[PDB]
Design a protein around this ligand. Sequence first.
Ligand SMILES: *[C@@H]1O[C@H](CO)[C@@H](O[C@@H]2O[C@H](CO)[C@@H](O)[C@H](O)[C@H]2NC(C)=O)[C@H](O)[C@H]1NC(C)=O
Ligand SMILES: *[C@@H]1O[C@H](CO)[C@@H](O)[C@H](O)[C@H]1NC(C)=O
Ligand SMILES: *[C@@H]1O[C@H](CO)[C@@H](O)[C@H](O)[C@H]1NC(C)=O
Lengths: 56, 7, 49
Amino acid sequence: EGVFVSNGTHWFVTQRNFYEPQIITTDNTFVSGNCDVVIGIVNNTVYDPLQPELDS
Amino acid sequence: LQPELDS
Amino acid sequence: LQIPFAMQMAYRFNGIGVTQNVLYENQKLIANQFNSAIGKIQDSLSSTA
Ligand SMILES: *[C@@H]1O[C@H](CO)[C@@H](O[C@@H]2O[C@H](CO)[C@@H](O)[C@H](O)[C@H]2NC(C)=O)[C@H](O)[C@H]1NC(C)=O
Ligand SMILES: *[C@@H]1O[C@H](CO)[C@@H](O)[C@H](O)[C@H]1NC(C)=O
Ligand SMILES: *[C@@H]1O[C@H](CO)[C@@H](O)[C@H](O)[C@H]1NC(C)=O
């Protein structure tokens, strides 16, 4: 529920009607298939909040 | 998650 | 407010209750079906009064 946006150096997700940037995460986003199909897809990290929690 | 991170 | 046209059409797919990836994964088919469907309007109006 949002749009991917960049300030020039970093990538965020915002709600569409008001600028409120958040870090892109596995619970801000959903997966569908591989990188080869989508026209204009970009390479960036997606953070997974469980992995440091298992690292406790 | 915190009860599961007990395991 | 500017937005890329394929991203505007992904918002319109969300508005009908179809998930955005259905547009981005079928974008060339959706564009062809639109371009074809406008060609039928052109032919029908060119054909009859
Ligand atoms: C894009 O946004 C990020 C926000 O994370 C900016 O990075 C921060 O910038 C300040 C000031 O230089 C630093 O104190 C922080 O440590 C930075 N955080 C990170 C995670 O790098 C970044 O400067 C912005 N870029 C532009 C071009 O505006
Ligand atoms: C936008 O145009 C550039 C070339 O100017 C191209 O590399 C890119 O794939 C295009 N992206 C989209 C979303 O159409
Ligand atoms: C993204 O990563 C792939 C990894 O194979 C690379 O080929 C590509 O050049 C990178 N950049 C873009 C914009 O796809």
